[PDB]
Structure formats: C-alpha cells, structure tokens
C-alpha cells in the first residue's frame, strides 16, 4: 500500500513549497494521479484478501472505500478554492495539508491489519477534521460543533480501546486474520455483553444511531464544504466499516442485543426523514437524510446476512457520492445567495439549467431511482431484513416514500418555482461547480453499470 501511501505523504511537500498560485493546480492534479493509482487497488483475489505486508492488507470491503477517498480528495480541492480564494498562502497550504493528512489517515485506517492500529488511525481522523470544522468554519456554532463532534466520538472511542486491549490480552492478537481464523464462540456472559457494547457503541456513535446522532446536524451543517463532504461521504462509513470488521468476534451474542439498536435505527430512519421534510436549511436536510441512510446501513450490519452486507457496502458507496454532491450543490446555491434557508432563493431551474439537472439526478440517486447503486444497495438490505423479519418492509416502505417527498421537496422549493426578484447576484454558472458535479455524477452511473466491484467481500 506504500505505492499509495508514499505518494500521498510526499504530496505534502509539493503543496507546502509550491508557489502562491500553483498550490491548487498541483494538489488537484497530483491527487488525481493518486486516485488513478488507487484505482488499481480494485484488483481483488477471489477469496484471499490482498496482504501487501504484515501491517497492511485489503479486501473487497476496504478497497472500494479507499478508492472512494482517493477519488474524493481532488473533489474537496475543487470545491474549496471558491471560499478559500481570499486567504494567505500559508493558511491555504495548511488547509490543503489538513486534507492530505485526513486522506492519509483514512488510507491507513482502511488498509490497517491490527484492530488497535485501525483504532489509532480511525480516531486520528478527528484532528484534521476538527481543525477544518473549527478554524475555517463560517457559521456560529462551529466552535460548539467541534466540541460536540469530538466528545461524541471519544465517548464511544475510549471504551472501544479498553475492549480492544482486553481482547489482545485474552485472545492473543488483534489481527483481523487471526481473530477470524482463530475465532471462538462468545458466551452469553454479562461481562461479554459489556465487551460487545464497548466494541459496538463507538462505531454506532459514528454510524450514527438514532438518539446519539446530534453531532451531524450540528457538525456537517457548520463545517466548510470540503470538511462537510469528507465527513458525510467517508467519515460516516468509518463506523460501518469497523462494525463489519468487528462482528466476526461478536457472535452469537449480537442477535440478542441486536433488538434494541436495530429498531432504534429502523424507527429512527423515519423520524430523521420526517425531520428532513420540515426543514428550513438545505445542509441540515442533507445531514438528516445522511443519518437515515446510515441508519439503514446500521440495520444491514446488524442483520449479519451476506445479502445485508453487500447491500450495506453498496449503500455506503452510493450515499457517500450522493451526499457529497448534494452538499456541493447546496454550497453553490448558498454562496450565490450568502444564506442557507431554502426559501430565500427559489425558482433557479430556469436561471441555471445545468444546476437544475445536477439537482435532478442528485435527488434521483438520493431517492434511489433504479438501477442506480443506491437503489440496489437499499433493496438488498430490504430483502435481507424481510428475510429476518417481514414487518420491517412497511417501515422500510415508509422510508423512501417520505424520502421521495423531501427528495423532491427541496428541488420544488429551490429551483422548481419562481425566482426572487430582489436578488440579482446569481451569476452565470461558473464551470468549476458544473464540472465538479460531473466528477460527482459520472462515476456513480459507471459503478451502476458494474456494481460487482462495490458489492463487498461477500460477492
């Protein structure tokens, strides 16, 4: 993985010494070649995970997420120099450095072999995101955002650390391959119940589960766009990925304690969706939609069914792409209006036809229009849940319904109407954002064409 790690690390000196004008160009292009190199990592052996070294390995679950992060890295670079144009060169270089360190930590996380190293980099993603959210944020509760986000993450992270070190003392090693091959049945002891809770609740905090999901409507809504997309697209996937890794040594106990959280998500995905309907801000609506989709992924994880795992992975990838695109579109409109209430600027479909389209298939993919990978990922989870329990369907059946409502509602109330007369700053569509939504959208349908890649390790 050092064919991807070493270039990512060496990307830091390039930006840190590039001229006052070349930082954006150089970072964008070289991150694009980094994504190209990581495109190779989609090469997967039939059943054996690709073990590059002792400390680094990859399989059909880590590789798609890694490719997602590496391909994403140019996208924040393209979305940031709009709101980062009027800044000192050193400050811009550090913003870029925060982004590269974030991507590097995500790569080491996804390619980590020992659970402790996975925890180290997984949590270590907090710091660059914290700096991005706090310093470069524009709204008020950004300072409150950082506190909420850090403390919510850590409150689950530390018990996970205690559980992992206890596992190391008892089992012998935290290596994934060992704990899977040398896996042993888990007894229904209450100490084992608390161990399962410690191993689960950190990822479920970052999932998020309903109830303890307040860090997203107070974090993604406030972060700069680059931070917002890197949060929603991948950082949410950290908990799902960790759960998929950890349920190997968390059975057969899970089912007995699967009952509270599963429905907590199942019911929660309704409320969040309902919360999406009666929203006032675009970014908050997208954040709550992300919460609902991630709750569906939670249900997929706790079913522990092959089909559930494949649908889960597909939903993570598709949701990352769709949420990043929706946040980018919201930023474009907000910057054009310097406000975020989704009533101030409506009826812009005529003014910006390409934005009107980009919003149209962004909503369609968010609404999971078949045969997009969003729809197949959702439907696989629906079928797995129905096999696990029939009634789930109606709740599932409710979700996209309400989702569809808001999935079109903002499009009705932001572009499908009459323009506001007193505003005039809406200029011609700068081709930067249009191109950015292109690099968002075309890979989505490309993966729709061949979903065997994002299908996960169960395929």
């Amino acid at each position: 993985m050092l064919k991807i790690i070493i270039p990512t690390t060496m990307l830091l000196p390039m930006t840190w010494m590039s001229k006052h004008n070349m930082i954006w160009i150089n970072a964008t292009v070289h991150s694009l070649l980094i994504s190209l190199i990581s495109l190779s990592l989609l090469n997967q052996l039939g059943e054996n995970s690709l073990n590059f070294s002792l400390t680094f390995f990859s399989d059909s679950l880590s590789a798609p997420l890694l490719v997602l992060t590496t391909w994403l890295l140019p996208l924040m670079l393209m979305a940031s120099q709009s709101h980062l144009s009027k800044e000192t060169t050193t400050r811009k270089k550090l913003y870029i450095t925060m982004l590269i360190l974030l991507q590097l930590f995500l790569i080491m996380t996804f390619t980590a072999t020992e659970l402790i190293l996975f925890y180290i980099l997984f949590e270590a993603t907090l710091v660059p995101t914290l700096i991005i959210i706090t310093r470069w944020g524009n709204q008020t509760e950004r300072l409150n955002a950082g506190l909420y986000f850090l403390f919510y993450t850590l409150a689950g992270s530390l018990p996970l650390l205690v559980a992992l070190v206890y596992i190391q003392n008892t089992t012998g090693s935290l290596n994934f391959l060992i704990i899977h091959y040398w896996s042993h049945p888990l007894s229904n002891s209450w100490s084992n119940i608390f161990m399962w809770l410690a191993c689960i609740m950190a990822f479920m905090v970052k999932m998020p589960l309903y109830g303890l999901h307040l860090w997203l409507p107070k974090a993604h809504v406030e972060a700069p766009i680059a931070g917002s997309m890197v949060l929603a697209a991948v950082l949410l996937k950290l908990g799902g990925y960790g759960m998929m890794r950890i349920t190997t040594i968390l059975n057969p106990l899970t089912n007995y304690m699967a009952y509270p959280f599963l429905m907590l998500s199942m019911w929660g995905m309704i409320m969040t969706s309902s919360i999406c309907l009666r929203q006032t801000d675009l970014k908050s609506l997208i954040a709550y939609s992300s919460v609902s989709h991630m709750a569906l992924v939670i249900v997929a994880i706790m079913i522990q069914t092959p089909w559930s795992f494949m649908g889960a992975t597909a939903l993570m990838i598709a949701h990352g792409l769709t949420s990043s695109m929706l946040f980018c579109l919201a930023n474009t409109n907000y910057e054009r209006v310097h406000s975020r209430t989704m009533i101030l600027a409506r009826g812009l479909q005529t003014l910006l036809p390409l934005m009107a389209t980009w919003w149209l298939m962004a909503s369609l993919t968010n609404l999971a229009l078949p045969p997009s990978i969003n729809l197949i990922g959702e439907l696989f989870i629906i079928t797995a849940s129905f096999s696990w329990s029939n009634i789930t369907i109606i709740l599932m059946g409710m979700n996209m319904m309400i989702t569809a409502l808001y999935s079109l509602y903002m499009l009705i109330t932001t572009q499908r109407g009459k323009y506001t007369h007193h505003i005039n700053n809406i200029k011609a569509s700068f081709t930067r954002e249009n191109a950015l939504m292109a690099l968002h959208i075309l890979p989505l349908l490309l993966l729709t064409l061949n979903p065997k890649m994002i299908l996960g390790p169960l395929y």
Partner: protein, 64 residues
Amino acid sequence: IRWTYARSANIYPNFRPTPKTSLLGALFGIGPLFFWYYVFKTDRDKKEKLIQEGKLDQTFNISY
C-alpha cells in the same frame, strides 16, 4: 432570520421541562419504542418456534 432563529436556536433555551413536555417526550420519543420491540420480537420468536420444529417453508430459501 427571525423565523429561522426561532425554529433553530430559541427552542432549547426557551424550553422548560413542564409536566406536559416530559409527558410528550415519554409518549413520542420512547413510547412507540416498546410497541415496535414487542411486535418484532413476537414475530421473531413465533417464527423461531417454527423453524426448529420444522413447521415452515425452507425448500427454496437458500438465499437470505
């Protein structure tokens, strides 16, 4: 902005845990909780007492 701040910021600072407020919280946030848990658990155990007793269809259910 007055509307947005009222429906986004003032809600908690102006919130007082009146008996009615706590009642509504109990009825909505945690009320249907036991309802859904009960119905789902009932289906799960009712079906479970159908597989291990053999009283269910399994002929072509090799995918789950």
